[PDB]
Amino acid sequence: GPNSDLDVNTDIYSKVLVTAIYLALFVVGTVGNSVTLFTLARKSTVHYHLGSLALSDLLILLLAMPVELYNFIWVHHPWAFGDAGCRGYYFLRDACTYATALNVASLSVERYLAICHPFKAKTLMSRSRTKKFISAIWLASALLAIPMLFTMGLQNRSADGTHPGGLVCTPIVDTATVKVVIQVNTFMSFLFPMLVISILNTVIANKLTVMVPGRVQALRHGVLVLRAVVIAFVVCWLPYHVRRLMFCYISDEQWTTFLFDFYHYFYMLTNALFYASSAINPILYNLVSANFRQVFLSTLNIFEMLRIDEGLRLKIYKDTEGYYTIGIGHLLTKSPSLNAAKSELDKAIGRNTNGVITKDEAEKLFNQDVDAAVRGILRNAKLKPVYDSLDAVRRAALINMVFQMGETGVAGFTNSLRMLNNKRWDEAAVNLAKSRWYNQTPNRAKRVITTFRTGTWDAYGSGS
Amino acid sequence: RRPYIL
């Protein structure tokens, strides 16, 4: 036959398996991302990025999966969508690919700022700049896909010069360009976003762990999700860009019937995983938020520690030393004047409180104070290297001290600090337990000392 | 002989 070599040899099982899979991903991903859009619409800046991500993934399924399933899984030749179809389909495939790539990446950069740079995030961001940001990543996505309009194209590969059943869509340009094009795709669609996602997520994950049983269980799944997101990206997208690079980097000299046959099976695997990304993303990225169980499934360390040690009160009290305090250990003033406090409390939040506040207002204060303590530690020579060397749990204990006594108070524990720095847990504990601190607040200090000497939550059985 | 599909 004149096209007989363009025949792809693959098990009919295999073709029936991948099809069943493909369509399974297709409903779950079309529904999930639709329902996601339906859910997000009826609801700071993450909600738009999640929606942008939802679209980009919905489009991968609707634009890429149908033609691939006809023309790449079953009927390999001929290409039944003409030359412009060939150019339009790889363009649109690539565009959505970049959109998802740039969305996932942006979404991580967005949550990096929210949690590690909340000052900027507040003043130097809004829902205007967000939509300016999102416009840019379809604008850019569409831009980056343009090469595909010129490198792809129809071609008659049949042994005879031209026979209608041997037309194929394929890179119809020299390998010096096609290798270059495919390695820009790989770099911008995978590596750049790999570095971004893998780094920032892990940085966010670590910071979030130190920040954060029932009341904070949401945030602890969020951490696991943050790490899951990276594994998900790698596994679903790495084989896809291997196959695209293998396509162009193996020379016609080295190609063999076996390799030819391998590739087309590898195609079934790689692309099935690729479509998985779009299907799971809506579920993975929306897990952390409340209403997950609800919305999709209808369609069928420092906070805890201080919450215990400082407690929570809504009226003004006098702390251990006798100073007017409110909420989660927020010292209002050292004055003995009960009015002077009320004045400073109204100033604090910005309204005539009369010495009483709401839980939201207490938790807003807390975060400002913890921010303050952590900046305190990171900006201090005597505290940064100690903190840097400690694990998530012991870091929190160091913050408990700074929250209680201040940055320059804790800098006074010159040797107890050195000992923690050098993992001499027992010696630190004994020397810490001989302090004025320990005398004033034995219960709290002993829990904090236990935390330093164990690295566990043994002290905080009362946590909720 | 090599793949034409990408």
Author numbering:
A (entry chain A): 50 to 92, 100 to 268, 297 to 384, 1002 to 1165
B (entry chain B): 8 to 13
From the article:
Binding of an extracellular agonist leads to conformational changes in the receptor, triggering activation of associated signalling partners on the intracellular side of the membrane. Previously, we determined the structure of NTSR1 bound to NTS8–13 (Arg-Arg-Pro-Tyr-Ile-Leu) in an active-like conformation with six thermostabilizing mutations providing insight into the binding mode of a peptide agonist. The conserved W3216.48, oriented parallel to the membrane plane, seals the top of a collapsed Na+ ion-binding pocket; W3216.48 in combination with F3587.42 link the agonist peptide, bound near the receptor surface, with hydrophobic core residues in the inner half of NTSR1.
To understand the structural implications of E1663.49, L3106.37 and F3587.42 on the activation of G protein, we determined the structure of NTSR1-ELF to 2.9 Å resolution. For both constructs, we obtained crystals using the lipidic cubic phase crystallization method in combination with the chimeric T4 lysozyme approach to improve the probability of obtaining well-diffracting crystals. Superposition of NTSR1-ELF or NTSR1-LF with NTSR1-GW5 reveals that the structures are overall similar (root mean squared deviation with values of 0.7 Å for Cα atoms, excluding T4 lysozyme) indicating active-like NTSR1 conformations. In contrast to all the previously determined GPCR structures, the W3216.48 side chain in NTSR1-LF and NTSR1-ELF is oriented parallel to the lipid bilayer. In NTSR1-ELF, F3768.50 is no longer anchored between TM1 and TM7 but is rotated outward forming hydrophobic interactions with L371. NTSR1-ELF was able to stimulate nucleotide exchange at Gαq to almost wild-type level. The dose-response curves for the determination of the half maximal effective concentration of NTS on the exchange of GDP for GTPγS on Gq (EC50 values) were multiphasic (Hill slope <1) for NTSR1-ELF and wild-type NTSR1, indicating high and low affinity agonist-binding sites at non-saturating G-protein concentrations. The structures of NTSR1-LF and NTSR1-ELF, presented here, are very similar (root mean squared deviation values of 0.3 Å for Cα atoms, excluding T4 lysozyme), yet their ability to activate the G protein in response to NTS differs: NTSR1-LF mediates moderate nucleotide exchange at Gαq, whereas NTSR1-ELF has almost wild-type receptor properties. The glutamic acid3.49 of the highly conserved D/ERY motif, absent in NTSR1-LF, but present in NTSR1-ELF, has been deemed critical for G-protein coupling. However, NTSR1-ELF may be more dynamic than NTSR1-LF, indicated by its lower thermal stability and thus higher flexibility, accounting for the observed differences of the kinetic properties of both receptor mutants.
